[PDB]
Ligand binder design. Structure first.
Ligand SMILES: NS(=O)(=O)c1ccccc1F
Length: 126
């Protein structure tokens, strides 16, 4: 069901949370080789999550589930904010700009924490 597809998407999201926190520890410790690998892993995870969320939204649309569509439109918009900040973080790593990297890292945490009440709302709506 669309609900079980959302649970699969939620787990992929939690995997990115786990890798992100590991990455943050590596950055603080100066282990740039580790950071590079974690950023690659995160890119692949976010790409997967993005695709799953799109399939969930498209299915809710085909089902006529208006409330779930509303919530998923809001959630996918916030996802794109996180993606843009993530991409900027990757660029800051490439460029050696640790000040920008720290900034983007905190921003991405706050955007992610904010979007969590909506994430739980969607589960209940599908
Ligand atoms: N989980 S999020 O903040 O919407 C997000 C989406 C895509 C990339 C990085 C991110 F942080």
């Amino acid at each position: 069901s669309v609900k079980s597809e959302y649970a699969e998407a939620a787990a992929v999201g939690q995997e990115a949370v786990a890798v992100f926190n590991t990455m943050k520890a590596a950055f603080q410790n100066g282990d740039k080789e580790a950071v590079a690998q974690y950023l690659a892993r995160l890119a692949s995870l976010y790409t997967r999550h993005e695709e799953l969320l799109n399939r969930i939204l498209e299915k809710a649309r085909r089902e006529g589930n208006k409330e779930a569509v509303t919530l998923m439109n809001e959630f996918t918009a916030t996802f794109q904010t996180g993606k843009s900040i993530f991409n900027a973080m990757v660029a800051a790593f490439k460029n050696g700009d640790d000040d920008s990297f720290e900034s983007y890292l905190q921003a991405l945490e706050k955007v992610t924490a904010k979007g969590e009440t909506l994430a739980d709302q969607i589960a209940k709506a599908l």
